[PDB]
């Protein structure tokens, strides 16, 4: 669906620094841009 490197491309920010947070916060990010 999306390469590991592409993850940082879609995220927009350092996936490493963002990964420091729980997936709970990721639920919003996906809605901010992605759809599902």
Swiss-Prot record:
Record's subcellular location: Cytoplasm, Cytoskeleton; Cell projection, Microvillus; Cell projection, Lamellipodium; Cell projection, Ruffle
Region entry Absolutely required for activity, spans: 30-33
Distribution of this protein across tissues and organs: Specifically expressed in epithelial cells. Component of brush border microvilli.
Q: How is it modified after translation?
A: Phosphorylated on tyrosine residues. The unphosphorylated form increases the initial rate of actin-nucleating activity, whereas the tyrosine-phosphorylated form inhibits actin-nucleating activity, enhances actin-bundling activity and enhances actin-severing activity by reducing high Ca(2+) requirements. The tyrosine-phosphorylated form does not regulate actin-capping activity.
Q: Which domain of life is it from?
A: Eukaryota
Q: Subunit notes for this chain?
A: Monomer. Homodimer. Associates with F-actin; the association with F-actin is inhibited by tropomyosin.
Family from the record: Belongs to the villin/gelsolin family.
Free-text function comment from the UniProt entry: Epithelial cell-specific Ca(2+)-regulated actin-modifying protein that modulates the reorganization of microvillar actin filaments. Plays a role in the actin nucleation, actin filament bundle assembly, actin filament capping and severing. Binds phosphatidylinositol 4,5-bisphosphate (PIP2) and lysophosphatidic acid (LPA); binds LPA with higher affinity than PIP2. Binding to LPA increases its phosphorylation by SRC and inhibits all actin-modifying activities. Binding to PIP2 inhibits actin-capping and -severing activities but enhances actin-bundling activity.
What's noted about domains in the record? Consists of a large core fragment in the N-terminal portion and a small headpiece (HP) in the C-terminal portion. The core fragment is necessary for both actin-nucleating and -severing activities, whereas the HP binds F-actin strongly in both the presence and absence of calcium and is necessary in actin-bundling activity. The Gelsolin-like 1 repeat is necessary for the actin-capping activity. The entire core fragment is necessary for the actin-severing activity.
Spell out the protein name for this chain.
Villin-1
Q: Which organism does this record belong to?
A: Gallus gallus
């Amino acid at each position: 669906m999306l390469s590991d490197e592409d993850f940082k491309a879609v995220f927009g920010m350092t996936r490493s620094a963002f990964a420091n947070l729980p997936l709970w916060k990721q639920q919003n990010l996906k809605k901010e841009k992605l759809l599902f």
